[PDB]
């Protein structure tokens, strides 16, 4: 908040600025953007015009970080991606042509699919009625479900590993297990869905 | 107003319920609202007119009442 | 209004008809007084709060060389003159 409310967030996308001539409403829109004499916040250190950066990978990176270490967390993220890659190459060369057509070697699509598989559909909020606290099923917003997915991942791969075991190892393990739906993280998501069905009547207590 | 004629009476009754409409609905002098009422009650217990619904036969008679159910 | 009845000629079909004989008799004396006040060099204020004729009245008073308050009347205006208007003041010798 060293920026007044006057300051708009920057649009970092290059493709937007490079190819303007085919869209009327957007031409009018960013015309109104700069011509309004609108101040713009200085673009963040984390965010780049890079063609190689995934916002989700960056969020997970941040969520891994302890203290002020961007270096150590980016390190463990890099190492985990590399570990998933090489684990899938090791799984690729020991297989046969069919399974060489099937198996995915992209650590990015494995990350995104593992997290989409690990995100919960529905959730639980406590509600006070008649001097008792009842756990009630609540539909969740998208961002909340993504968050829950990532946080559950980091929670498990921090907590449940043996102390000898390194982080990129355990994390790549669980990324590949949650890709295939068989990981303890998806078991947690299932505990949530089962506790959301056990209480389903109590869905009337929700007033919103 | 005569208890013997069920048509005129059942004009002032709610079709679905069998209730008697009030003044704000029928729009009568107090005298005639009274009269209609007493008449209805008498015709109902003497066995001329049904209590719990308007007799289907009289459904399509002129509607004099101000109520609108279906909107 | 109850005090208006001696001034009414009568009521024609619910509308009240003011007796214009009395109206003339009164308006005579009113104009008489008003002129005598202006003759002796004293301040005449036209007061109305009605927004139709506000402009008309302000115009009228400006053209008689007289003063008009047609606006929202400030609370202590006549009672507490010295504070609202100034250190010492003259007050209207007649108000219309």
């Amino acid at each position: 908040s060293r920026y007044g409310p006057e300051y708009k967030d920057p649009q970092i996308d290059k493709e937007y600025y490079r190819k303007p001539l085919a869209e009327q409403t957007e031409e009018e829109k960013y015309e109104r953007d700069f011509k309004k004499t609108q101040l713009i916040k200085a673009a963040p250190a984390t965010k780049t015009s890079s063609v190689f950066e995934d916002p989700v990978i960056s969020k997970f990176t941040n969520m891994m970080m302890k203290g002020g270490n961007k270096v150590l967390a980016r390190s463990l993220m890099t190492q985990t991606l590399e570990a998933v890659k090489r684990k899938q190459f090791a799984k690729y060369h020991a297989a046969s042509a069919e399974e060489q057509a099937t198996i995915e070697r992209n650590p990015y699509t494995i990350f995104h699919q593992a997290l989409k598989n690990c995100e919960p559909v529905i959730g639980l909020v406590p509600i006070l009625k008649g001097g008792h606290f009842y756990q009630v099923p609540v539909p969740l917003a998208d961002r909340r479900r993504r968050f829950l997915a990532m946080k559950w991942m980091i929670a498990e791969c921090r907590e449940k590993k043996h102390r000898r075991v390194l982080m990129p190892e355990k994390l790549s393990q669980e990324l590949l297990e949650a890709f295939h739906n068989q990981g303890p993280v998806i078991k947690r998501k299932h505990d949530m869905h089962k506790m959301a069905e056990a209480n389903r009547a109590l869905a009337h207590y929700r007033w919103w | 107003v005569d208890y013997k004629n069920v048509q005129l009476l059942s004009q002032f009754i709610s079709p679905f319920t069998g209730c008697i409409y009030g003044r704000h609905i029928t729009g009568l002098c107090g005298k005639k609202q009274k009269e209609i009422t007493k008449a209805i009650k008498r015709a109902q217990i003497l066995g001329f007119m049904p209590v719990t619904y308007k007799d289907p036969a009289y459904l399509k008679d002129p509607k004099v009442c101000n109520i609108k159910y279906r909107e | 209004h109850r005090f208006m009845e001696p001034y009414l000629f009568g009521s024609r079909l619910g509308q009240d008809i003011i007796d214009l004989e009395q109206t003339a008799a009164h308006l005579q004396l009113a104009l008489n007084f008003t002129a005598h006040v202006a003759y002796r060099e004293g301040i005449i204020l036209f007061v109305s709060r009605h927004r139709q004729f506000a402009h008309l009245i302000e115009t009228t008073a400006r053209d008689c060389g007289e003063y008009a308050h047609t606006r929202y009347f400030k609370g202590g205006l006549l009672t507490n003159a010295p504070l609202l208007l100034g250190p010492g003041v003259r007050l209207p010798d007649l108000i219309i």
Partner: protein, 137 residues
């Protein structure tokens, strides 16, 4: 298109058929909707019981079975057991004013069953028995 909200009187010539049957021949779904529970029973026009489903029958328990979700579940279960005996259409009779009225009705609809008429028969004394005393003296 002339559509009457009012039903087809028996003595009338009126021709409307649902699967060829007269309005009178259609089975009846009785829904008792009470504050603590909802019971549903589908019956022949001849008053022979076809199907019975309740919120208790549906494996809910005390407070839970009051809710509209439970009513809907019982409605679906009822419509299933009823279509098993092959009833396509039904006339609904709703007895009582409670949490499970509408839920049990559209739970009959959701349960793959067709509702033609919806009647409300709720006991309305013209002053019979005095009801029990008000709570919080």
């Amino acid at each position: 298109s002339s559509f009457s909200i009012y039903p087809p009187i028996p003595g009338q010539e009126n021709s409307l058929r649902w699967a060829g049957k007269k309005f009178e021949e259609i089975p009846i779904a009785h829904i008792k909707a009470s504050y603590n529970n909802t019971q549903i029973q589908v019956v022949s026009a001849a008053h022979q019981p076809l199907a019975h489903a309740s919120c208790g029958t549906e494996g809910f328990r005390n407070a839970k079975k009051g809710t509209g979700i439970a009513a809907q579940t019982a409605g679906i279960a009822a419509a299933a057991k009823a279509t098993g005996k092959g009833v396509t259409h039904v006339r609904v009779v709703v007895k009582g004013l409670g949490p499970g009225r509408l839920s049990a009705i559209k739970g009959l609809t959701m349960g793959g069953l067709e509702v033609i008429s919806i009647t409300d028969n709720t006991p309305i004394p013209h002053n019979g028995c005095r009801p029990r005393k008000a709570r919080r003296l």
